[PDB]
Structures are given as structure tokens and as C-alpha cells.
Amino acid sequence: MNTPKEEFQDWPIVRIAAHLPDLIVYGHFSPERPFMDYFDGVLMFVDISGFTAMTEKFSSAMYMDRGAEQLVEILNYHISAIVEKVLIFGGDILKFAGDALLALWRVERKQLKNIITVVIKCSLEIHGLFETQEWEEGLDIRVKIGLAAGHISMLVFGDETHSHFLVIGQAVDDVRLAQNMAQMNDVILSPNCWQLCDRSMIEIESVPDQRAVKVNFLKPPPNFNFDEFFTKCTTFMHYYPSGEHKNLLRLACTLKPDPELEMSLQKYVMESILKQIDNKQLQGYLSELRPVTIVFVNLMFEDQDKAEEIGPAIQDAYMHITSVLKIFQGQINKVFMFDKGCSFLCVFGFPGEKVPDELTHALECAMDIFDFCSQVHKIQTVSIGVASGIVFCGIVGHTVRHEYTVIGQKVNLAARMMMYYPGIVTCDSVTYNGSNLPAYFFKELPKKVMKGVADSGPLYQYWGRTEK
Ligand SMILES: Nc1ncnc2c1ncn2[C@@H]1O[C@H](COP(=O)(O)CP(=O)(O)OP(=O)(O)O)[C@@H](O)[C@H]1O
Ligand SMILES: [Ca+2]
Ligand SMILES: [Cl-]
């Protein structure tokens, strides 16, 4: 009797699982919202620098009319290489934020020390991918890596059709601080990661005025075999592809149809992505250099580390945000904890979602979210950045692990606006001029120099309908 090789495993549930980390795929959590889980782990924050200047130059006559196709192609060529490293070293890719990426090695606290060594070896192989090459003749893109280790909380929130997850706490806060301390080609360890790490293994140099450290080299001791050490660590790696599946990057590639799991997994993914997954739309439809309006909402709390206090507030804000956006086909692209505060990256005019008077609605929507979230229990400050223009929209990452992302100077601009002008709604010149709303709805703001943005142009507070 023949035993033919089981065919390519390409079910909708497998395609859905590409968009989600193992934290969610194999999560099986309560029905309730908010949901909170606590554990420990080791985080990697990989930032790519250069790619919004790339988005600008790919949004030029140069690339004829294939700017976004050429852009996602070269972006995914480098990002698939990093995703491969992280996966092969046992990491779970939690989230893509443009050309930036957060990874988790979730592990029992006694294994944190050993797992930090694994995550360092990984960090240095990632850097070593970008020691060689370059694009636009010479060099423009390298990576900065921040590492943290300790307590981690996960928050799951949403309603009957949508779900979003966040990771929270001091190791989350630390991994961001560690990353923006780094220069190109650096691996920065958070203080508690350096405190929990195997110091016989790792040569470091001190960071000026910062308690964090900078990794120089792995100097393993004489009886060290990394492959044997790695194998030892895999005992602690729940979902690490092994046995008949050692040839796979993700155990999630072996997921079988399960209606109840698929039902819960699809709530994390946009309906335009599911449409593609269902072969009801062309696979290239979703890669676009497209005019959009970014609404970046940031919520500050007295204590951004306590999921128990803040999770209800995030849930309540989500419930209001989701109903304000629905009206105008606005989307919550991502939610994430960003150097203080819970941030909602909201997008007006995604593919097939282009409402008329996008700018007036983006502004009215912002004020609405501003006023609601200001009266929610335990939200200290609400800040909203509004920016409009040509951004790259597309599926970013690896075949086995990818998400829909927005990339561009306008995304950086909205994000930086909500931080340099806290407690207000702000907008750029494109939104202000374009809305054509009367000039007294706006207040022109002082000029601030802002990180990761060259000329913002004139900026405005959206004051709203009344003088109040
Ligand atoms: N898709 C996205 N999701 C979440 N945050 C985003 C984002 N795109 C941009 N941002 C935010 O916007 C800011 C971008 O500024 P920086 O981090 O200074 C840019 P960079 O890493 O030097 O280079 P880049 O502009 O080439 O990406 C960050 O604070 C980041 O959180
Ligand atoms: Ca980045
Ligand atoms: Cl997150």
C-alpha cells in the first residue's frame, strides 16, 4: 500500500495563524474582556532605521509605478531574515510596528539567566546580517536592539467580533528605554536583564548616566558548546519545532481546521486580510502607497505597569474607540505600550475603506475619543496626533509570521505629536488645510524639534466646535 507524503498544509486557520504570535495561537484564554495573564520572559526590541526615508524615496518617479511593490519587496527581504533568526533561536514574534518588531522568549523564572544568553547570541547574529550589505548605493539601514528580562503581563481586550492583545510592565517599559539608548549595530541590556544575566558569558561596556549596559562580545568559557547549551534551553521552549516537524519554522504551520479556534483567532485580523486569506481578493491588492489619515491615540496612567488597574480603562476606551471609528470605516491598526502610555494606531481610508470628507471625520473622531477617554476612570492624560498623507500599507514580515503595517513619515509624525504635545488633539498642515473647517476650530502651535521627523510643517491643536 502507498504512503504518499502529506500535502502542503495551507488551510485558512494556518494563514490566519501567520498574523498572530504563539502567545495567542496556543493561548486558549477566558471569554471575558479584559483578560490578564502574568508570566516572566525575555524581550527583544529590534528597530529598523532608514525605512521611512526609503518610503519617501520609493514614493518618487524613480521606481516608476511600483513604489510600494518594490518597497514591500526589499522591506520583507530583510525583515524575513530577522524573523528567521528570532524563530530559529526559539523566540515568538509578538508584534510588528512598521519596520520595528517585538519578540518574546516566555520562560520559567529559573531559566531567565540561560535564556538571556540565547537571546544575546540571537541579537548578535541579527546585527551580523547587516554588517555586510546596504541599499541606495551605500549604507542607509542598520538595526538597534534593546533587550529586557523580568515580569510580563498580557492584556487581551475587545468585543464579540474584535480582539487586541498588549504586553505590559517594567520589562516592557525597559525594552523600549534600552532600544532608544542604542546606536546602530548595538545590543543594549536593560538593568534587570544585566542583573539576571550570565556575566561569565558576556563582555559589556558601561552606558553614560544610564544603569543599562551595552553588549560588546560573547566570550563563552572553555567548556562551552552553544548547540548543546541551546538544546538544553529547548526543554523550556514549549512550541519549538521538533521531531517530524524540525524542518518547520513555526509549530503553527501544522495547525488543523478547528472552527472554535479559527473563530477566536480571526477576531485579531482585519476583514480585508481575511478576504485575501479566503482567496476572495488578489494578494497584491493590500500593498499600497496610499493617502491616509493617522489618528494616534495615547492614554497615560498613574501606573502603566499594573494590568489590573489599567486593563479596565483600556477596555472601556477600546469600546468607545471601536464605535467612533465604525461610523467612518476607521481601523485600529495596532495597540502597544510606548515609553509611557497605551497607544492606539488608528487609520482612516485603508484599502476599500475610503470614506468621503476623511479629514473632518478624522478630526471630529479624535475630539470624541479625546472627550470620552478623558472621563474614563484611571486615565491620567489623553493625547492624540493626527497626520495625513501618503503612507505605505502592507503585509510585513515573513511568509510564516507577518502582519499588516503602516510605514511612513506621517505615522512617525502623529506618534511624536501625541508625545511632544501631551493632553491635547494635534494635527498637521495637510489635515488642517484639507478639512477646510473654519480656522477658529484650530490653534496654531509653537515649533518643536521632534525625533524621527524632519520638518513637521505648521502644527495645530484641534480646539474643536466651541471656545469651552
Ligand atoms: N507602524 C507603526 N506602529 C507603531 N508606532 C509607529 C509606527 N510607525 C511609526 N511609529 C512610531 O513613530 C516613531 C518613529 O520615530 P523613530 O523611532 O525616531 C524613527 P527610526 O527608527 O529612526 O527610523 P524610521 O523613520 O526609518 O522608521 C516611534 O516613536 C514609533 O513608535
Ligand atoms: Ca523603526
Ligand atoms: Cl504588545
Side-chain angles (χ1 to χ4, degrees):
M1 192 143 45
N2 299 343
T3 50
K5 185 205 84 77
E6 170 247 60
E7 55 164 352
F8 188 53
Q9 292 305 275
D10 191 37
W11 305 102
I13 197 174
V14 172
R15 297 180 163 203
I16 287 154
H19 287 266
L20 296 175
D22 299 337
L23 192 78
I24 302 293
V25 175
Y26 299 110
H28 292 66
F29 322 115
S30 288
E32 72 204 61
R33 298 292 176 264
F35 178 80
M36 287 128 299
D37 219 337
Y38 306 94
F39 49 85
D40 295 299
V42 172
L43 293 179
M44 185 185 277
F45 198 77
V46 176
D47 178 70
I48 329 315
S49 180
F51 251 100
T52 71
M54 276 204 182
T55 312
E56 286 297 314
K57 68 133 187 182
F58 280 108
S59 201
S60 90
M62 222 72 250
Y63 300 94
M64 283 142 293
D65 280 290
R66 297 188 53 254
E69 290 85 8
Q70 285 240 225
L71 182 49
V72 78
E73 184 187 12
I74 199 55
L75 177 83
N76 284 168
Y77 177 57
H78 303 292
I79 293 182
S80 307
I82 293 159
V83 168
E84 271 200 29
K85 291 284 192 201
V86 164
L87 293 191
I88 290 176
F89 278 89
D92 188 10
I93 284 122
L94 295 189
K95 223 169 237 160
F96 295 87
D99 48 24
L101 172 159
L102 181 67
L104 169 64
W105 285 250
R106 181 185 174 167
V107 99
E108 52 173 78
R109 206 180 279 113
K110 292 186 166 186
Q111 297 315 317
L112 280 187
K113 185 189 186 171
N114 280 339
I115 291 287
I116 289 161
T117 304
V118 168
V119 178
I120 285 169
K121 186 73 184 282
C122 191
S123 287
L124 295 174
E125 289 189 28
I126 289 156
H127 285 301
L129 300 167
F130 308 106
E131 64 189 354
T132 41
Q133 22 91 84
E134 52 184 30
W135 298 115
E136 175 67 72
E137 48 106 74
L139 198 271
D140 293 309
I141 68 286
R142 250 134 210 179
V143 321
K144 299 155 178 172
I145 296 158
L147 300 183
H151 309 295
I152 307 160
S153 305
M154 176 213 211
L155 179 92
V156 186
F157 64 87
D159 53 40
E160 284 308 310
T161 44
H162 305 304
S163 311
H164 297 270
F165 74 91
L166 275 170
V167 291
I168 301 298
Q170 194 57 238
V172 175
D173 300 349
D174 293 341
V175 75
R176 188 86 63 156
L177 300 167
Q179 186 268 121
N180 43 57
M181 283 184 223
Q183 302 278 62
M184 73 207 294
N185 223 117
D186 287 353
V187 184
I188 303 284
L189 303 184
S190 81
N192 186 230
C193 175
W194 163 240
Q195 211 64 231
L196 306 166
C197 83
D198 192 335
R199 302 171 177 204
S200 91
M201 294 286 320
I202 53 111
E203 271 321 315
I204 58 105
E205 60 172 66
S206 304
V207 181
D209 299 83
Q210 296 290 162
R211 273 199 310 117
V213 304
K214 182 190 155 281
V215 188
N216 284 309
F217 338 102
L218 215 86
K219 210 72 208 173
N223 276 100
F224 199 76
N225 193 277
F226 188 77
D227 298 342
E228 288 168 342
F229 174 82
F230 189 78
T231 303
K232 266 252 186 171
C233 301
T234 62
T235 299
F236 308 109
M237 296 177 182
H238 190 339
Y239 302 117
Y240 192 73
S242 304
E244 46 205 35
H245 303 116
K246 74 179 322 307
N247 51 294
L248 302 180
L249 286 168
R250 286 193 79 195
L251 186 60
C253 304
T254 67
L255 260 194
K256 303 272 86 101
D258 178 351
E260 188 200 306
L261 182 56
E262 176 159 337
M263 253 174 70
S264 92
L265 296 185
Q266 76 154 259
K267 293 167 161 72
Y268 294 91
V269 190
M270 241 191 331
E271 74 156 299
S272 65
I273 305 277
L274 300 158
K275 197 175 181 183
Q276 198 191 284
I277 278 151
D278 287 324
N279 309 140
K280 282 188 170 70
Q281 159 185 106
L282 293 163
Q283 306 280 313
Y285 183 83
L286 283 178
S287 289
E288 234 209 276
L289 284 169
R290 187 181 182 81
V292 302
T293 301
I294 307 298
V295 185
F296 228 122
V297 178
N298 178 255
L299 315 173
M300 297 292 202
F301 311 91
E302 188 84 282
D303 211 297
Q304 62 150 352
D305 293 331
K306 282 164 169 183
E308 335 87 45
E309 265 190 50
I310 76 163
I314 297 175
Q315 173 60 207
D316 299 342
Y318 166 86
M319 287 309 278
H320 197 86
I321 295 164
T322 191
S323 72
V324 166
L325 298 183
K326 190 172 168 277
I327 305 161
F328 301 116
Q329 284 107 297
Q331 298 273 156
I332 301 185
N333 180 71
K334 306 257 172 238
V335 195
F336 59 87
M337 302 294 292
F338 158 58
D339 259 352
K340 304 278 157 209
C342 177
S343 300
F344 288 71
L345 200 180
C346 307
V347 185
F348 291 80
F350 263 153
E353 322 221 30
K354 266 267 188 195
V355 107
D357 305 353
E358 183 180 278
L359 295 176
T360 322
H361 294 334
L363 288 174
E364 284 160 14
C365 287
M367 189 54 73
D368 196 320
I369 293 160
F370 186 88
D371 293 326
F372 182 88
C373 298
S374 300
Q375 339 279 322
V376 168
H377 195 43
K378 288 183 191 160
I379 308 190
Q380 202 170 34
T381 312
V382 185
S383 304
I384 303 176
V386 183
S388 315
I390 292 150
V391 311
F392 172 79
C393 300
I395 304 164
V396 167
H398 186 296
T399 295
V400 308
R401 189 66 195 95
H402 52 209
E403 288 161 12
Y404 196 77
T405 332
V406 286
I407 301 175
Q409 294 269 49
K410 293 291 184 192
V411 193
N412 299 11
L413 200 241
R416 299 305 187 174
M417 264 157 60
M418 93 200 161
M419 307 301 294
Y420 288 74
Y421 307 85
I424 66 162
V425 172
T426 50
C427 76
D428 68 353
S429 295
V430 177
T431 309
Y432 167 83
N433 295 114
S435 79
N436 194 52
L437 277 177
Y440 57 85
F441 274 54
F442 301 95
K443 174 196 183 166
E444 196 174 358
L445 283 177
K447 288 260 86 194
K448 292 178 147 118
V449 207
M450 296 184 294
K451 300 281 270 292
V453 29
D455 207 16
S456 57
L459 297 182
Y460 309 86
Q461 150 155 226
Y462 182 69
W463 194 274
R465 294 280 322 187
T466 46
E467 286 280 358
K468 281 256 184 188

